[PDB]
Amino acid sequence: HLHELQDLYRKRQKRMAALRHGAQVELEAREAVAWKTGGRGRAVAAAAKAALDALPLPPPEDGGKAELAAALAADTTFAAAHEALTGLLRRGVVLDAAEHLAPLLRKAGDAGQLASALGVAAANHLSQAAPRHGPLHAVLVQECRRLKAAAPLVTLWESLHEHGLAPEAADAAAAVRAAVELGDGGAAVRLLMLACMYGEAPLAGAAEAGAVLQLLQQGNPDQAAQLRELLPKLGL
Amino acid sequence: MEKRQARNSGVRKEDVGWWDPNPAADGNMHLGLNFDRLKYWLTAGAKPTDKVAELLGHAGVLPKVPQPPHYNPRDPKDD
Amino acid sequence: LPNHGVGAIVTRDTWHPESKKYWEVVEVAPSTADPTKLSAWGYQYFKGERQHPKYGWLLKEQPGAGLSAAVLQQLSERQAAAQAA
Amino acid sequence: MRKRELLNEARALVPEGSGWLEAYTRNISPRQLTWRLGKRDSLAAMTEGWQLYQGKFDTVAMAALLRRLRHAQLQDPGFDPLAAQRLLDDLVPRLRSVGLRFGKLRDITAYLHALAKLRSPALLTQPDALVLDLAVFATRNRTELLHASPQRLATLLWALMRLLPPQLYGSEQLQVVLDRMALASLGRLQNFAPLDLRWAALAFATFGPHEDVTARRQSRNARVIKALCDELAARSGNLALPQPEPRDLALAAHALGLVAAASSPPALLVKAAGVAARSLPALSGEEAVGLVETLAVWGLRQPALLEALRDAAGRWGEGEQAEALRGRLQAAYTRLG
Amino acid sequence: TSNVMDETRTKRIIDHFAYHKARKQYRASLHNLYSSWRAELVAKQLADPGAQRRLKAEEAREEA
RNA sequence: UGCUAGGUGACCCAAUACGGGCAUCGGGCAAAACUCGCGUAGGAUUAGCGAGCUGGGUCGCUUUUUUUUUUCAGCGGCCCAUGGCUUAUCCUUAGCCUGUCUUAACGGUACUAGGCCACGGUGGCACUGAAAAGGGGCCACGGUUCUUAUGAACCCAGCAGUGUUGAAUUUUGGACAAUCGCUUGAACGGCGGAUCCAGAUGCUGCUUACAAA
Fold first, then answer.
1. Which residue in chain C is spatially nearest to A225 when comparing CA positions?
2. Do the chains contact at C32 and A8, CB–CB below 8 Å?
3. Where is this region: Disordered (chain B) (predicted)?
């Protein structure tokens, strides 16, 4: 019932250990009957698939924290660290958001790298519920002012909107603020919509929405007219 | 006539019945079954197929079966 | 990708919306050895009352502080304002 | 080539007069063991098979072994009950090591039928703790009890009716078994054979009336007897289904009289009066005499039945058990006038 | 059988269920009628056979 | 064992309200498979059976499961009793019976439809299935094609159709509508060279000058 939840990871730890040594002793047996009957051709079916069943690399007894230290090493580039981290997400390890993911997203350099780190983070909270949104949001606002990307922030709010994960109103305030110094008010008004959509109060918009309307007065007054119409449609 | 045999084979079943689907001058269908072994075979779990079930229901020795669940335009010119 | 979601309420899009048909998913007793065949243990509710103690699963509200129903209605009006732009 | 080493391993367990040793395999299936025990007639041969193959017997082998013990009891002339009893004692720890860890309800029911078959007339005994623990272990899971056959469940009931001493009918494990079996069988009442209903009625009558939970158990077995006895009453006379034997309706009537005598006018007694009074010489006397006791405890008078049983009462001879039948039937006759 | 609408698919589900419905009450009447037929069949060959008449014919042949 | 109806569901699908699939149980009747009693072409220019040629014991002969009672065989291994048959074996012809024709009948012999068996180019063998293979699986043979020759592909005694031989042998037709089968819970659904309809072609039963209502 609920013990089948603990015993699925327990018995499945046993079952994956079982499949590893059983698949390994048959993989070491088909190679002995490989050259005698030409057995390589169907043997490589096993030698790929039976290793590459549900997880090929094991969940580490350490937790692989030394491999994390090899992965969060500041000399290692973003692609190799990214593929190591996704390979350890496939190994089912619950990770710390600040120790591992935040140096990864500081190692992120362009917008698609930030979005890839967000996919990593969403899978991390997926494994975590199998959640810690605050300091990830703060360091990603740091990467927003560092590297001038706004749509990954909206992508984070959408990714936590899909399953119902709520960050802080201070996180919303810093998000709308970083949209103000960055300068894409369409992302800011979608941020204001998504921050409304959790049932949260609309962020005390006399300051933040005033900063947005200041940005959109200096930029383009037509969407500012649309904003002044939309501002009482939130109730602000 | 079980599932194995064809329509015209030698069958352990005694009768599909005196039968004449051709209309005959008035009261147009045929005389029906001969009897007393029809009830034994249908009692013994021998299945009917669809139209013998319709004919047996239509003769009123069995209740009838509703056929149509829905209507879409049937083509009468297939022949 | 998994099922887990213990105790959710959703509907199917093909279900008639006033016929009031929705699940209390009990648990998940899955096969992780085999990835296509899954089972979702369910206390189904139909016309409000419980029946048992694919594509098209449709996301309704989740009451419990979360995203409540009338709160979803107000925010659905604010989504309509969001495409009103 | 290793047949002589296999033969030496066979020689190390059983003396040299056995035909099993030429037949011996280490890699035997239990299917072949059930047939090979089914091929023997003598208790020496089952002893040979037991000391050869104690390691490979699951519960089906024990059940076939007990049937072969009954077979030798009625066909092997040189029978020793003491050797049978010590061997039956040797059967216990194999059960406790294996069959109480891997027993499905089919296998355990088969063994308990075989043991009651051994204790049947035409005295060997096992510990009753094993019988009750086999009963609770075969019914520990609801799902296989839901898919069980009526023959299986009434066979289990006849086993528990034959094996147990009367002091242990009040034991809680038998009541747990009856709880599970009522909760299974009351949904599939209409899947029942009338013979299986006969044994269900007799066993719930035997075990039923034996603080709130126990009176609730008696009330629940009261609803089991009233629904199941009305199921037999409906099944008698309805000629569309197989007609129940008048022996079985008579003996279930005696079960109704037993539970009425222990707990203290259905159609079942009326239809039992009909099926007896049409077919008395197919009936044995003592079941009908017990039905006369049921007529006594209900106070009803079945007229042509009682004159027919008067005719049957004259037609016995004089002798100890037969005169006891005449005496108790005369006593219940005076109870009914 | 149907998907993602609410107009006139209710009619399709109605005729769907009513067709399988009336087939099931046909099936129940089918039960009761065959069971009645078995009742007169075993009524007839439980009514006369097994009587003493076959023994009368046999004892007439044997007295001959 | 296989079908159909029932009754059950801590299952799955459908449901403005309820039925299907899916698992299991049991009632009905049922197939299947084996056994034996008899029948059966001629040949002495086939007279002994080159063989376990028959029987008894012992095992192996791949499941318990409702009350007094219940579960084949040389089929293989071993001993053993030394017998078993003598139109026995061996040869060659040949699917068998009802049929059809004739005879007055008894009989004697080419078909109709249909009963059963056998076989699928030849031979050996296995999986699964309760039971085994005519367009299922593996190998060897014999054909037919192609290779840069190393090897692969195929097997109409299914339909039409081609070729030899023959005195002689048919349309490379239409269609699932009717059955009947297989299948599918919508849908008069899908498919079937079974069949049903048309052709060519012996036999037959039965009409036939047009005009006009």
1. C85
2. yes
3. 1-24, 60-79
